Amino acid sequence: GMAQRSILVGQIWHEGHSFNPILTREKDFLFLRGEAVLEEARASSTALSGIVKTAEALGYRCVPSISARARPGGAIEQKVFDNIVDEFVQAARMQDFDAICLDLHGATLAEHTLDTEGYLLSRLREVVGNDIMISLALDLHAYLTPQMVEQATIITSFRTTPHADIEETGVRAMTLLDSLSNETRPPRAIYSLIPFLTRGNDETWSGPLAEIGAAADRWRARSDVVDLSIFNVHPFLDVPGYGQVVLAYDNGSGAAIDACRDLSDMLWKARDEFQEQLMSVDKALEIARTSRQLLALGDQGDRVMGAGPGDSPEIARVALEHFPGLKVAVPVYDPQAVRTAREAGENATVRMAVGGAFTHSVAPLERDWTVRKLCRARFTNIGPYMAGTEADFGDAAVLTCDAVTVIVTTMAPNVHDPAFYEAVGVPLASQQAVVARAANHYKLSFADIARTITVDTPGLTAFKPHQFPFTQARPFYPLDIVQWSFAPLECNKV
Numbered sequence: 001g002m003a004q005r006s007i008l009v010g011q012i013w014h015e016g017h018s019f020n021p022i023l024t025r026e027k028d029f030l031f032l033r034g035e036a037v038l039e040e041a042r043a044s045s046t047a048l049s050g051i052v053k054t055a056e057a058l059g060y061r062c063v064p065s066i067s068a069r070a071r072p073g074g075a076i077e078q079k080v081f082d083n084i085v086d087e088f089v090q091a092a093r094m095q096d097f098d099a100i101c102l103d104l105h106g107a108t109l110a111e112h113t114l115d116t117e118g119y120l121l122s123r124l125r126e127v128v129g130n131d132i133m134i135s136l137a138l139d140l141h142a143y144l145t146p147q148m149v150e151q152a153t154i155i156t157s158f159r160t161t162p163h164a165d166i167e168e169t170g171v172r173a174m175t176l177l178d179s180l181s182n183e184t185r186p187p188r189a190i191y192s193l194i195p196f197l198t199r200g201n202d203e204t205w206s207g208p209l210a211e212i213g214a215a216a217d218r219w220r221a222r223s224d225v226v227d228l229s230i231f232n233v234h235p236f237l238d239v240p241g242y243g244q245v246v247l248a249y250d251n252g253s254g255a256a257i258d259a260c261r262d263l264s265d266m267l268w269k270a271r272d273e274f275q276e277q278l279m280s281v282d283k284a285l286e287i288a289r290t291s292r293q294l295l296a297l298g299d300q301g302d303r304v305m306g307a308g309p310g311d312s313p314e315i316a317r318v319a320l321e322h323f324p325g326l327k328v329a330v331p332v333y334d335p336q337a338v339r340t341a342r343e344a345g346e347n348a349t350v351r352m353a354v355g356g357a358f359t360h361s362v363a364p365l366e367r368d369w370t371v372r373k374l375c376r377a378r379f380t381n382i383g384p385y386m387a388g389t390e391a392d393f394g395d396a397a398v399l400t401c402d403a404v405t406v407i408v409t410t411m412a413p414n415v416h417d418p419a420f421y422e423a424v425g426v427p428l429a430s431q432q433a434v435v436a437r438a439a440n441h442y443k444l445s446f447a448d449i450a451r452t453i454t455v456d457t458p459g460l461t462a463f464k465p466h467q468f469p470f471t472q473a474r475p476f477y478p479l480d481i482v483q484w485s486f487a488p489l490e491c492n493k494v
């Protein structure tokens with residue numbers, strides 16, 4: 001037809017954990033619909049922002065479906081996930097569009113649906129058919145499945161950890177889609193599963209991913225590679241077809257197989273390089289005790305950014321027991337503690353076990369807690385990571401005992417930014433160490449005001465596969481000693 005071309009756009013952001021017993025609920029989501037989806041995209045720096053800004057700079061009209069963002073955590077309540085998909089499907093019916101370009105995480109998880117993105121693509125194709133193009137921007141932590149490869153025209157992921165190319169990945173999803181406009185066929189896809197999980201040393205600026213990322217850039221610079229991505233799968237999913245994935249696209253007779261071979265072999269060779277020795281909590285708290293600079297401690301074992309619950313009071317425990325007088329603040333998921341605190345009121349002292357209700361691996365911390373402040377854990381992230389984005393971890397109580405402050409929260413405490421501490425009235429200057437529930441994504445946000453050390457704590461996000469009852473994920477390395485060699489799936493062979 002003759003009319004301006006339009007692109008259907010939308011977003012889902014959620015990362016799951018098969019071993020977090022706390023379901024992600026409707027409350028945990030921010031939803032936008034209609035034009036508001038596009039207004040937010042233009043004012044932000046997500047992959048969706050990239051998709052929408054690029055589509056509009058290129059002359060396309062963008063048509064909204066919805067956007068749905070919830071912090072990482074347990075599987076989404078199935079009904080809520082079903083309602084999200086239905087809103088996508090309905091937008092796919094009601095609207096006029098010539099192609100679809102979406103910002104999805106790739107490791108969203110629902111209580112019954114294990115491959116959520118794959119499922120979403122199928123439901124959309126039920127309504128839109130197999131001719132129109134669908135392009136995805138994905139997080140590199142995606143659980144990338146054969147169904148996804150089969151149901152999408154093209155897929156591209158982040159290339160940095162910590163994730164600093166989020167928007168650019170969106171730009172590229174849309175640019176790739178636009179580039180395919182005159183093609184008489186979809187591009188050929190080569191999928192390769194390398195059956196191991198990473199256990200740290202997984203940043204892209206140094207370590208094994210720097211070499212592998214360099215090789216990847218050279219492959220993509222060839223005129224006979226359309227694109228390629230490397231997925232370091234989120235390592236807390238009990239799902240089949242599990243491991244690292246290399247995904248490459250060409251015109252049917254380019255280098256997608258060679259690229260995928262080279263990179264799969266490098267990842268395999270490097271499988272035991274993805275390990276680290278994090279500093280102990282005792283050593284880190286002793287640096288804090290002897291430093292003028294604030295310490296910001298990444299609680300590796302209980303990261304909400306790794307879809308953990310954030311109920312570990314462990315760092316508070318060690319501070320209390322081994323460093324009396326050391327001023328440490330820790331954010332802890334404990335909705336009951338909040339409610340107990342709210343009933344006692346500000347200024348009361350209550351004997352109470354805080355934290356540890358959800359992570360089997362750490363004990364609740366029981367003390368005479370004084371309730372210094374009741375307030376809402378609502379604030380704006382300074383960033384860089386998620387700069388400008390508003391957060392709300394629910395009703396909160398700031399609790400003290402000896403020199404330790406525990407801020408208990410009603411919703412998952414995705415603390416990766418200094419604004420949290422200021423918003424709940426625990427000023428950073430007042431502490432010698434504070435806790436971030438992230439390993440990599442808090443560092444830039446605290447770089448200017450703290451020494452950042454990620455510490456070797458226990459819990460549901462420790463890089464210890466042997467601690468989890470993986471069932472349908474197995475076999476994978478390190479748990480199983482498997483004899484892998486390159487064996488790709490090919491899709492849209494020409």
Ligand SMILES: [Zn+2]
Nearest residue numbers: 139140141163
């Ligand atoms: Zn990620």
